[PDB]
């Protein structure tokens, strides 16, 4: 039943070219946030959505196919539940003191230095991160751990990255 329902959701979202564009993704995510008054956001904007699609577009078609979209969408569902669970003051936002528990719950165990860098790059002047910023961050963070793992074939925790690979991974993002 869930497999059939998800297939229908994808079919209706993707439309006539059978892939999910940045605009299509933006529009469905903004529909989600309308339904959840407990998620504070200024909206998912197009630039943020083009970045999400690029970092998830493993076959470089420009758009998200069934499996690419499935991976992203199920992550967003999980991360949404986490954001609500770790917003322990109901601000509708994740503050700097809430952030480590939320990221750790999502399987990302970072250190103070890296949390500080995340807050600086993604959170506002008060140290608060809203829903679109949080989802944009996690999608990227997950992709960057996955890219590292794919290059660390010998399991040493060091990767060698050539210039071409570097430009692909940073620019198509």
């Amino acid at each position: 039943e869930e497999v059939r329902q998800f297939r229908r959701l994808f079919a209706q979202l993707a439309g006539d070219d059978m892939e999910v564009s940045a605009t299509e993704l933006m529009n469905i995510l903004n529909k989600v946030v309308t339904r959840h008054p407990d998620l504070k956001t200024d909206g998912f904007g197009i630039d943020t959505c083009r970045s999400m699609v690029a970092v998830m577009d493993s076959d470089t078609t420009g758009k998200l196919g069934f499996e690419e979209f499935k991976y992203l969408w199920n992550n967003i569902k999980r991360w949404q539940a986490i954001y609500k669970q770790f917003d322990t003051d109901r601000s509708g936002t994740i503050c700097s003191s809430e952030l480590p528990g939320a990221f750790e719950a999502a399987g990302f165990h970072l250190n103070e230095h890296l949390y500080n860098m995340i807050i600086r790059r993604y959170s506002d002047e008060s140290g608060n991160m809203d829903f679109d910023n949080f989802i944009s961050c996690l999608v990227r963070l997950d992709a960057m751990f996955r890219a590292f793992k794919s290059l660390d074939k010998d399991g040493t925790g060091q990767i060698q990255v050539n210039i071409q690979e570097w430009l692909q991974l940073t620019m198509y993002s």
Copy 2:
């Protein structure tokens, strides 16, 4: 005279913390585009501006100091002139056939594969790129070349990193 005028522009823009925030950068860049009706754009948005500030924030204060802002602003000026020069049909946008000349004029030599990625990430469905997208792309592209070259002083074409280093280098919206 121009040194004095630029110092005044920065002082008035940066205000009471003497650094330029993503919001302050957004506001001045949108003022620029108002003055140049020959540059087509849907505006500089906040997410794009937060990314620009982060990639330019080499002393990790969160905002752009005098020298950081000077380096960014002078790049934007050069790239704006290039955009007008390589828009050889006066559309107010850079098409896929105008892009290589514009990037080459800005010093960047990329393979066909990378251009295809950049056009998918930054250009519209017709292959046309607007002004904010063009500037956002070049600021990132320049930053990513500088980051890599700093870590490959030898010119091996390869860098070695651990996960912390990787995430510091790549966690840029």
